[PDB]
Amino acid sequence: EEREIDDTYIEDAADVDARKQAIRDAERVKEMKAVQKDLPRPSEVNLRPLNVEPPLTDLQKSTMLHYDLLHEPSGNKKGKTVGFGTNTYLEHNPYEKFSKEELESLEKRLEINRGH
Amino acid sequence: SATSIPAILKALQDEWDAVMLHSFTLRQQLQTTRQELSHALYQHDAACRVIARLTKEVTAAREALAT
Amino acid sequence: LICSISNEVPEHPCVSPVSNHVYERRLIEKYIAENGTDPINNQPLSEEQLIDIKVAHPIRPKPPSATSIPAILKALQDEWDAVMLHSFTLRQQLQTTRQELSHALYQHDAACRVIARLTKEVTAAREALATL
Amino acid sequence: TDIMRNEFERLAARQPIELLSMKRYELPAPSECVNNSMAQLEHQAVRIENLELMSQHGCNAWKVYNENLVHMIEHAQKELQKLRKHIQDLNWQRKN
């Protein structure tokens, strides 16, 4: 004779289904993250992989039109495991490239202060 | 130094004036290194979606070669 | 402002010279007559050792304010010592972002060589199969 | 009997001229200024964080220090009486 156990189990089962959907929604969206710019995507192209990430950014954000919403968790896990295999010597090549990317700008800082 | 004292007033003014900008410049650079890092994460996850379609085009090709 | 023995506002404050603390004369006097000791530290103290609170001597003072030169100098320590910790919040958070950027750009540099080979292999499979 | 401090202090008082401070932060001008802007931002942040602490900090202490000043004042006027009483006695003695 169960009583408030089926309600606890239904809440536990509904809790489990929410844990499966949030994790398998998206790797980049769940982890962490701008104005809409079709002219910036048009100017950057004027090369194909750069245009693919630009349309991916405009889709997730939704002069801005939305459309792309069909591009599930198992295919992303195998995609993440495969790319991890491709990536001491590997640690130094990532530290050197991070220093290169770390290495016009003054107007943005002044406006950031004007907000402050 | 023997340095005039009215001048030492304007030094301490300049040194606080400098440290205020040396603290400011170091914070907007932190926000933009995190901002440019976030642009790399979108391209990282967008690229591994584009590899899935390219693997399908290779899988479709391996089936046609067998026939 | 308070007496440490009773907890009242003492109407005749006398400061001891063994445990530095402002006691009420009438209260501390009875504590000494009970036993020659200071109530807090239990060090020896007599009634002559106790000293009333006095005006310094001949130099005139003014109350503790923000204008006063020494209070203004200790203020500028608070300013800089707080701003020095503000720099740590951005130095420590920079060492996490650049460390995640270094591993991110390495995974980008390790992956984009595999995008270049699949674009070669899937087009080579289309170049091979279509010709046959 | 002091170091360099005494030379510039006595010269400042004799000449009747205070050393000029940083008359810069208040005026400034729109359209080097990228730094001046970033200095302003940080300054404001400090003030605001500091101001916020000060109101709450100030509110907590806005009157706790005023109580200390009343304990400090009453002690002086007790000594005014103790001095008043001795001297009066002396005068009376002389008169007698």
Classify C13 as helix, strand or coil: strand
How far is the C-alpha of A102 from the C-alpha of B37, rounded, in Å? Answer: 10
* Tokens encoding D29: 């001008």
Collect all residues of chain C within an 8 Å Cβ-Cβ radius of residue B37: 97, 100-101, 104
Rounded to 5 degrees, what are φ and ψ at C51? -135, 125
Angle at D58 between CA D54 and CA D61, to 5 degrees: 145
Cα of D4 to nearest chain B Cα, Å = 7
Residue A46 contacts D where some CB pair is shorter than 8 Å: no
Find chains touching chain B: ≥3 CB pairs under 8 Å: A, C, D
Cβ partners under 8 Å of residue C48, min gap 6 = none
Window 27-86 of D: residues touching C by CB (8 A cutoff) are 46, 50, 65, 67-69, 71-72, 75-76, 78-79
Which of D3, D17, D19 is most worth mutating to test chain B (most B CB atoms within 10 A of its CB)? D19
Residue D21 contacts C where some CB pair is shorter than 8 Å: no
CB C46 within 8 A of CB C71: no
How far is the C-alpha of A69 from the C-alpha of D32, rounded, in Å? Answer: 46
How far is the C-alpha of A12 from the C-alpha of A18, rounded, in Å? Answer: 10
DSSP state of C51: E
Q: Which of D12, D35, D37 sits opposite B5 (nearest CB)?
A: D12
**B63 lies in which domain range?**
1-67
Sheet holding C22-24, edge to edge: C22-24, C13-15, C51-52
Place of tokens 């202090």: D9
For chain B, what is the domain count?
A: 1
**For residue B56, which of A20, C122, D95 has the smallest C-alpha distance?**
C122
Angle at B53 between CA B49 and CA B56, to 5 degrees: 140
Cβ partners under 8 Å of residue C38, min gap 6 = C16, C18, C19, C44, C45
Classify C23 as helix, strand or coil: strand
Q: Which of D46, D68, D79 sits opposite C1 (nearest CB)?
A: D68
* Tokens encoding D52: 């916020």
Contact yes or no for B5 and D9 at CB 8 A:
yes
Which chain D residue is nearest to residue C82, measuring alpha carbons? Answer: D46
Give the residues after which the backbone of chain D is interrupted, taking a C-to-next-N distance over 2.5 angstroms as a break: 31
Residue A107 contacts D where some CB pair is shorter than 8 Å: yes
Rounded to 5 degrees, what are φ and ψ at D35? -70, -55
Q: Which of B28, B32, B48 sits opposite A83 (nearest CB)?
A: B48
Cβ partners under 8 Å of residue D5, min gap 6 = B5
How far is the C-alpha of A54 from the C-alpha of B46, rounded, in Å? Answer: 9
Q: How many CA atoms lie within 13 A of B2 on its CB side?
A: 0
Place of tokens 């005039």: B4
